[PDB]
Amino acid sequence: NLIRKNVDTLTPDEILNLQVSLRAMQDDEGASGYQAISAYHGEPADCKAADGSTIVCCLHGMPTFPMWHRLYLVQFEQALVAHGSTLGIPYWDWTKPMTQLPELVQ
Amino acid sequence: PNPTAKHRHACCLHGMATFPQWHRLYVVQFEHSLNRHGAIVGVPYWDWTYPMTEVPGLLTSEKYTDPFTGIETFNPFNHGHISFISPETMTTREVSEHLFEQPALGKQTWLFNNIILALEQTDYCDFEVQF
Amino acid sequence: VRIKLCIPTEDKRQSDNCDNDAGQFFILGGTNEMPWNFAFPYLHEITDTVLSLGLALDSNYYVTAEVTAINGTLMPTQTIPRPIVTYIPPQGFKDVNMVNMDTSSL
Ligand SMILES: *[C@@H]1O[C@H](CO)[C@@H](O[C@@H]2O[C@H](CO)[C@@H](O)[C@H](O)[C@H]2NC(C)=O)[C@H](O)[C@H]1NC(C)=O
Numbered sequence: 624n625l626i627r628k629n630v631d632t633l634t635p636d637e638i639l640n641l642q643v644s645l646r647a648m649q650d651d652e653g654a655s656g657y658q659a660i661s662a663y664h665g666e667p668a669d670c671k672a673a674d675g676s677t678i679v680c681c682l683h684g685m686p687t688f689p690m691w692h693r694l695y696l697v698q699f700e701q702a703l704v705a706h707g708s709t710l711g712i713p714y715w716d717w718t719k720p721m722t723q724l725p726e727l728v729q
Numbered sequence: 730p731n732p733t734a735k736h737r738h739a740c741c742l743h744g745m746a747t748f749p750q751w752h753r754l755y756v757v758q759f760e761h762s763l764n765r766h767g768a769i770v771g772v773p774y775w776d777w778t779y780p781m782t783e784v785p786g787l788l789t790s791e792k793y794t795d796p797f798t799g800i801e802t803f804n805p806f807n808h809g810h811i812s813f814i815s816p817e818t819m820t821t822r823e824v825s826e827h828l829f830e831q832p833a834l835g836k837q838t839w840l841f842n843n844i845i846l847a848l849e850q851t852d853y854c855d856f857e858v859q860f
Numbered sequence: 861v862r863i864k865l866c867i868p869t870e871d872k873r874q875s876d877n878c879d880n881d882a883g884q885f886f887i888l889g890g891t892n893e894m895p896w897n898f899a900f901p902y903l904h905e906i907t908d909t910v911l912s913l914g915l916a917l918d919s920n921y922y923v924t925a926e927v928t929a930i931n932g933t934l935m936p937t938q939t940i941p942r943p944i945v946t947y948i949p950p951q952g953f954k955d956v957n958m959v960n961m962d963t964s965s966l
Pocket residue numbers: 733734735929930931933
C-alpha cells in the first residue's frame with residue numbers, strides 16, 4: 624500500500640523526497656513526465672467524442688467522473704513513484720477551515 | 730458599464746447634465762496623483778476667458794530645462810503616450826487659427842461671447858448645455 | 861452560481877424581496893468541454909435560511925440565480941435553467957384528506 628498522507632502532517636524528509644522527485648518528474652519530456660501526464664487532462668485536447676470535433680479527454684458531469692479521476696490519480700501517483708516519491712500523493716482536507724493555501728505550495 | 734462587461738461604452742459623461750460633475754471629479758483624480766507625486770500646487774489652468782495670442786509654454790515647448798539642476802529633458806506636458814496601441818505611439822496636435830482671434834471694432838472673440846452666453850443662464854441644465 | 865431567496869409581493873411594484881442570499885455553488889467547464897447534462901437535479905439545501913426568514917418551508921417563495929462567469933463577467937440569467945424549490949415533508953406525513961361525499965351532483 625502506497626500511503627497518501629495529509630499534506631499538513633508531512634515530515635520535512637517526506638517533503639524533501641516529494642520535492643526532488645517531482646522536480647525529476649518535471650524534467651522528463653518522456654510519457655512518464657509531468658507535462659505528458661497533465662496533457663491527459665484538459666488542453667491540448669487529443670480526444671474526440673460524439674460529434675466529430677476535438678474534445679477534452681477528461682470526463683465531467685457523467686457518472687464516469689469519479690472513476691476517471693481515480694485512475695488519473697493512480698497514473699499520476701505512479702508517474703511520481705517512477706521517481707521516488709517514497710510516498711503517494713497527499714490529500715489536503717479543505718473541509719477543514721483555512722487561512723491560506725497549504726504551506727507546501729504557499 | 731462595469732469592468733467585466735462583454736460590450737462596453739466610453740466611460741465619461743458627455744452631452745448630459747452631469748457632464749460638469751463627472752469631469753470635476755475626473756480632474757481631482759488626476760490632481761491627487763501628481764500632488765502625491767510631488768507637485769506643490771494643484772492642477773494649473775489656461776483660461777480662454779482672455780483672448781489667446783499663443784499656446785502656453787509648458788504646453789508647447791517640446792524640451793524642458795530644469796533651472797536648478799541645469800539638465801535638459803523632454804517636456805512631459807508636450808504629449809502623452811498611448812500604452813496599449815504601442816510604446817511608440819504619442820498624442821499629436823493641430824492648432825486652428827480660430828483659437829487666436831482678437832477683438833475687432835465692435836466684434837468680440839467667439840469664446841468671450843459664448844462663455845458669457847453660458848454664464849448668463851439661470852437654469853443649471855440651460856447652463857450645462859451652453860457650457 | 862449565487863442563490864437568492866425571493867419572497868413575492870402581490871403588486872405591480874416588482875418589489876420581490878430577493879435581498880437575502882440562500883446559497884452558492886460552482887461549475888467547472890471550458891471551451892472544448894465534453895457536452896454534458898446531469899441525469900438528476902442538483903439539490904442545494906436552503907432550509908436554514910428559509911426558517912431564518914420566519915416563513916414556513918412549505919409556504920410560497922422562490923429561488924433565483926446570479927451567474928457570474930469565471931471571467932468576472934456577469935451573465936444573463938437565461939444561461940442556466942431556472943432553479944426551483946424542492947420541499948420534503950416530515951415522514952411520515954399525510955397531506956389533508958379529501959372533502960366528503962357529493963352534495964349531491966358531480
Ligand atoms: C468571459 O465571458 C464569456 C466566456 O465565458 C465571453 O462571452 C461569450 O460567452 C458565450 C457563452 O457564455 C459565447 O457564446 C460567446 O461566444 C463568448 N464571446 C466571446 C467574445 O468570448 C466573454 O467574451 C468573456 N468576457 C470578456 C473578457 O470579454
